[PDB]
Structures are given as structure tokens and as C-alpha cells.
Design a protein around this ligand. Structure first.
Ligand SMILES: [Cl-]
Ligand SMILES: [Cl-]
Lengths: 138, 136
């Protein structure tokens, strides 16, 4: 029969320590994409983020919008603006990230650095430079 | 705030898919003697070791099986022959799956490293053992 569950404070009291995962932040994955073409990406841990992300990118409209899809323990957040998609994936267990505020800062720095060259580039054409920018916003 | 919809409304009935854990939603797993960790494996980054040692310092040596809860998480452990097998999941993880995983882990660690466990240094089974912890 399954073992008891007790509060950890019953062993260590009120100073029981707290887990801070993923640097204190909820975003595991972010991409800049145009339609199904990913221009830049960054993962904060290992996961099969790409495959499902492309599935979403292929189904969503290209009109301006903002939306969150939920699945299991994750939320997939995006802003689409001028056919360009800014997307990030959050882990529901982790400490609160302001997903839309991050995507907005990402978009701004992407629109500034590249602007409408995003409209044209090959898959991954900005990955080397912009990846570390994605890692640094956060 | 943008609206939140289920992903199945966009994609249809998906199936399994996202794994910080190339499979099972276990975030961390460890084998320890008192506070000496012998082998460990993490599925993402964070302060698992510092937190886990605080718990291990206080878990007694007697045979026992138990889950502690704290915040969003569950710490499940089996202590047998003074060795603790511990894993961390979230709150929504089916607890019987944690113990069946830890029981599998204990069996192999017993078979392989007999009672060298009582004297082995920190991390002395880590290269070999982490990639069996990894494979569930
Ligand atoms: Cl915690
Ligand atoms: Cl949200």
C-alpha cells in the first residue's frame, strides 16, 4: 500500500528549505519564427520542444494575436505581430515568469536588430546572435 | 491577459509529448548514505543538492518509506540498510509510480554495489549509476 505523505515542515520546521529550479524562472524554451520557419531559438533545459512547437506554428493564424495554450504541466504563450511569432513555453511548477512581458522585450530587440529582414531569412538565419539575446532577456 | 485555451482545441487529441525528463516527470533522483550522495541525476537545473542535503541530514537511518510535501513538490524516499533512495516530483505525480521507480532503483543499486555502499566515497557510483537512474 502506498506510503504516507507528510509535510516537510514536520521534519525540519518552518525553515524547511525551498527549491528554486531553472534559475528561479518558468521559461524552458523560446523561439522567433515566421509561419513554420524558426529563425532563432533557445532552450533552458533538454526537452523535445521543437516538434510540438512546429505543430503549433503550423496551425496558428498569421494575423496579429496573443494567446496561451495549456497542455499537461506547460503553457505555450505567443504573440504574433506582422506575421512574426514570438513563442515561449512555461513550466506550471516553477516560479512565476511574466511570459508576455518577456515576449514583448524579445520582439522589441528582434524588430530593432533585424526588422523586416525577418520576413525573408532562412530557418535559423539569426540563431547564433539572437539565441544569447533570448538567454539574456531572462 | 490573453485568453488561455486547451492545446487540444488547436491540435486535436495529442498524446504524451513534453519531457524535461526524456520520459517520466521525475525532476531529481539520488542515492545517499547519511548525507553522502553516491549517485544523482537531475532533469533540469536548480538547487536540488543543497535542498536535498538538508532533508537527508535529518532523515533517520531506519528502514522506512515516506513522501514529504513542500510547496509545489513531493520528496519520496525509501531507506533500506542505511541507504536512502530519493526522488522529487511535483504534486500532480502519481505517488505509487514514484515508489515503483525507487524500488526498481534500489534493486539494481543493491545487486550492483552490494555493501560497498557503506564505505564508498561521495559520487563513487555516479558515472556508472546516473545513467540507469536516467533510464526510467
Ligand atoms: Cl520546495
Ligand atoms: Cl497565461
Amino acid at each position: 500500500s502506498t506510503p504516507e505523505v507528510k509535510p516537510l515542515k514536520s521534519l525540519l520546521g518552518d525553515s524547511a528549505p525551498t527549491l528554486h529550479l531553472n534559475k528561479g524562472m518558468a521559461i524552458l524554451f523560446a523561439v522567433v519564427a515566421r509561419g513554420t520557419t524558426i529563425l532563432a531559438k533557445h532552450a533552458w533545459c533538454g526537452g523535445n520542444f521543437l516538434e510540438v512547437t512546429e505543430q503549433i506554428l503550423a496551425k496558428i493564424p498569421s494575423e496579429n494575436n496573443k494567446l496561451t495554450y495549456s497542455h499537461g504541466n506547460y503553457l505555450f504563450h505567443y504573440i504574433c505581430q506582422d506575421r512574426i511569432v514570438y513563442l515561449c513555453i512555461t513550466d506550471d511548477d516553477f516560479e512565476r515568469s511574466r511570459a508576455f512581458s518577456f515576449l514583448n522585450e524579445v520582439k522589441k530587440r528582434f524588430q530593432t536588430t533585424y526588422g523586416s529582414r525577418a520576413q525573408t531569412a532562412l530557418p535559423y538565419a539569426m540563431n547564433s546572435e539572437f539565441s544569447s539575446v533570448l538567454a539574456a532577456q531572462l
